[PDB]
Enzyme design. Structure first.
Site, short mmCIF file in Angstrom:
data_model
loop_
_atom_site.label_atom_id
_atom_site.label_comp_id
_atom_site.label_asym_id
_atom_site.label_seq_id
_atom_site.Cartn_x
_atom_site.Cartn_y
_atom_site.Cartn_z
N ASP A 10 0.85 -1.18 0.00
CA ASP A 10 0.00 0.00 0.00
C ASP A 10 0.89 1.23 0.00
OD1 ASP A 10 -2.90 0.90 2.04
OD2 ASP A 10 -1.68 2.11 0.66
N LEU A 11 0.74 2.08 -1.00
CA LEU A 11 1.58 3.27 -1.10
C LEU A 11 1.14 4.44 -0.30
CD1 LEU A 11 2.46 1.43 -3.28
CD2 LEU A 11 2.97 3.39 -4.69
N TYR A 15 -1.17 9.80 -5.15
CA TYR A 15 -1.19 10.93 -6.09
C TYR A 15 -0.20 12.02 -5.67
CZ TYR A 15 -5.51 9.05 -8.17
OH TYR A 15 -6.46 8.24 -8.76
N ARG A 47 -0.83 16.43 6.10
CA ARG A 47 -1.68 15.69 7.03
C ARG A 47 -1.36 16.10 8.46
NH1 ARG A 47 -2.27 9.41 4.72
NH2 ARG A 47 -2.62 10.01 2.54
N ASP A 102 -3.20 1.95 -6.09
CA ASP A 102 -2.01 1.93 -5.23
C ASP A 102 -1.83 0.74 -4.32
OD1 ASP A 102 -3.67 2.04 -3.01
OD2 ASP A 102 -3.67 4.20 -3.08
N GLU A 103 -2.73 -0.23 -4.38
CA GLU A 103 -2.62 -1.40 -3.53
C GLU A 103 -2.47 -2.65 -4.38
OE1 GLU A 103 -5.63 -1.85 -0.46
OE2 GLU A 103 -5.73 0.34 -0.24
N1 LIG Z 1 -10.85 10.31 -6.25
C1 LIG Z 1 -10.61 9.44 -5.26
N2 LIG Z 1 -9.35 9.06 -5.03
C2 LIG Z 1 -9.21 8.18 -4.04
C3 LIG Z 1 -10.19 7.62 -3.16
N3 LIG Z 1 -9.61 6.77 -2.28
C4 LIG Z 1 -8.32 6.85 -2.62
N4 LIG Z 1 -8.01 7.72 -3.69
C5 LIG Z 1 -6.82 8.08 -4.33
C6 LIG Z 1 -5.99 9.28 -3.82
C7 LIG Z 1 -4.58 8.73 -3.54
O1 LIG Z 1 -3.59 9.34 -4.31
C8 LIG Z 1 -4.67 7.24 -3.92
C9 LIG Z 1 -4.39 6.36 -2.78
O2 LIG Z 1 -5.53 5.87 -2.03
P1 LIG Z 1 -5.30 5.33 -0.53
O3 LIG Z 1 -6.63 4.86 0.10
O4 LIG Z 1 -4.30 4.34 -0.47
O5 LIG Z 1 -4.70 6.55 0.38
P2 LIG Z 1 -3.32 7.32 0.16
O6 LIG Z 1 -2.21 6.72 -0.80
O7 LIG Z 1 -3.71 8.52 -0.55
O8 LIG Z 1 -2.70 7.61 1.59
P3 LIG Z 1 -2.38 6.54 2.71
O9 LIG Z 1 -2.23 5.12 2.12
O10 LIG Z 1 -3.59 6.74 3.71
O11 LIG Z 1 -0.94 7.08 3.16
O12 LIG Z 1 -5.93 6.99 -4.34
C10 LIG Z 1 -11.56 8.04 -3.42
O13 LIG Z 1 -12.49 7.64 -2.76
N5 LIG Z 1 -11.69 8.96 -4.47
MG LIG Z 2 -2.22 3.99 -0.44
MG LIG Z 3 -4.58 2.41 -0.08
#
Ligand SMILES: Nc1nc2c(ncn2[C@H]2C[C@H](O)[C@@H](COP(=O)(O)OP(=O)(O)OP(=O)(O)O)O2)c(=O)[nH]1
Ligand SMILES: [Mg+2]
Ligand SMILES: [Mg+2]
Length: 373
Positions: A10-11, A15, A47, A102-103
């Site tokens: 998981d990244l 984005y 954050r 990203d997963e």
């Molecule tokens: N438009 C949109 N993008 C999403 C949603 N959930 C996730 N993303 C997008 C934004 C992030 O660049 C990418 C990664 O999703 P993640 O759930 O893994 O969270 P993220 O990498 O952003 O941060 P984290 O893993 O919590 O450090 O996907 C959503 O519900 N809508």
């Molecule tokens: Mg992620």
């Molecule tokens: Mg994720």
DNA sequence: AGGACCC
DNA sequence: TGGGTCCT
């Protein structure tokens, strides 16, 4: 075949990472990625200053009146990096399942065994863990399962190192005996770290959740269904009556999610391979007069045809989806699906009117090429 | 065609 | 609230 070693990769703020790599000057600065009026994601710097994923731009700036924002409406570069990540993991081991951009899940079982068979009846006592051990659990070197999971953590560490060295990306990893557990444990130590789950800590991990909605597989709907039944905590679900649950959610959903409540999940990691569909969207301030506004649809095809092309395979179906403004339609979409002329397959002009006819038969607008071959 | 679930 | 996957 029985005991599996699964890794969930998981990244970190995907984005945001891609944007920071593009424009270095954005690093160390709180960065939020915007889509319309949302901040879908943001770097950790942001954050810290209160910015949360999927937060209104306003609520975002009146929380961080310095937050740098970049538009992330065009997913092209995110999508491209996402596949580079998957391909890199596939090199370690072919069975890789994508979950979003990203997963990734990788079944390391075969790989772990081969590595063990190579070790000698001695160095197998020198086996060590890479990263965190969930619940700081004690390792028992004579427990074959502990040894396998530890090798699993080593592989995971190698994958994360490779992702960073070859792609410039940081991320978390979770190692466990199944997808459910691997996904739940990968987020324990959140920023660019990894965790492995030993069996004796499974219940501790599952009970650490505060609501059933947190369990992968149980959505917004089922969560509400369970509430209305008095089922709120993970233990409630574990102890609830199989019959009543079975007779109200379907022997399928019921028998499956109750397994999940115990940390049990036998679903296989599925090889995602190439995409099963290609679609582009465009939400806009209720700006569509029901006609002439299809010049937007021409834009969609523009890129879609460029993507559907590049790929190599050809789609044998096209679709159009739309939305309509009014009350609080918590769920309202419509689409007209129709085959694509074998001749037109082998360019826009035809397709344009094709979608137009599909249009008339019917805030957002999206074309979707599916049924690839 | 539409629904549920996921990131 | 910009994309995807698979099931009814
Ligand atoms: N438009 C949109 N993008 C999403 C949603 N959930 C996730 N993303 C997008 C934004 C992030 O660049 C990418 C990664 O999703 P993640 O759930 O893994 O969270 P993220 O990498 O952003 O941060 P984290 O893993 O919590 O450090 O996907 C959503 O519900 N809508
Ligand atoms: Mg992620
Ligand atoms: Mg994720």
């Amino acid at each position: 075949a029985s005991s599996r070693v699964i890794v969930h990769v998981d990244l970190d703020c995907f984005y945001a990472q891609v944007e920071m790599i593009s424009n270095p000057e954005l690093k160390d600065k709180p960065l939020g990625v915007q889509q319309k009026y949302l901040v879908v994601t943001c770097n950790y710097e942001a954050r810290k200053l209160g910015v949360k994923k999927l937060m209104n731009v306003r609520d975002a700036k009146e929380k961080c009146p310095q937050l740098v924002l970049v538009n992330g409406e065009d997913l092209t570069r995110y999508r491209e990096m996402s596949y580079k990540v998957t391909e890199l993991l596939e090199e370690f081991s072919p069975v890789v399942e994508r979950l979003g951009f990203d997963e990734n899940f990788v079944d390391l079982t075969e790989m772990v065994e081969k590595r063990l068979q190579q070790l000698q009846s001695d160095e197998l006592s020198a086996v060590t863990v890479s990263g965190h051990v969930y619940n700081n659990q004690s390792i028992n070197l004579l427990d074959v399962l502990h040894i396998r999971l530890l090798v699993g953590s080593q592989i995971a560490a190698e994958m994360r190192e490779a992702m960073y060295n070859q792609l410039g990306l940081t991320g978390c990893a979770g190692v466990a005996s199944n997808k459910l557990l691997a996904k739940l444990v990968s987020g324990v130590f959140k920023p660019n770290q990894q965790t492995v789950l030993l069996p004796e800590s499974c219940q501790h991990l599952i009970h650490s959740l505060n609501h059933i909605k947190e369990i992968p597989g149980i959505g917004y709907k089922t969560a509400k269904c369970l509430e209305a039944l008095g089922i709120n905590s993970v233990r409630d679900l574990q102890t609830f009556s199989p019959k009543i649950l079975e007779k109200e959610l379907g022997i399928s959903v019921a028998q499956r999610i109750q397994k999940l409540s115990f940390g049990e999940d036998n679903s296989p990691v599925i090889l995602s391979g190439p995409p099963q569909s290609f679609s582009e969207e465009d939400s806009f301030k209720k700006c569509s007069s029901e006609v002439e506004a299809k010049n937007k649809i021409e834009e969609l095809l523009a890129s879609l045809l460029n993507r559907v092309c590049q790929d190599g395979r050809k789609p044998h179906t096209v679709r159009l989806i739309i939305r309509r403004y009014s009350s609080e339609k918590h769920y309202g979409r419509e689409s007209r699906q129709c085959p694509i002329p074998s001749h037109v397959i082998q360019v826009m002009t035809p397709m344009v009117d094709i979608l137009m006819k599909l249009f008339r038969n019917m805030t957002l607008l999206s074309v979707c090429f599916c049924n690839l071959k």
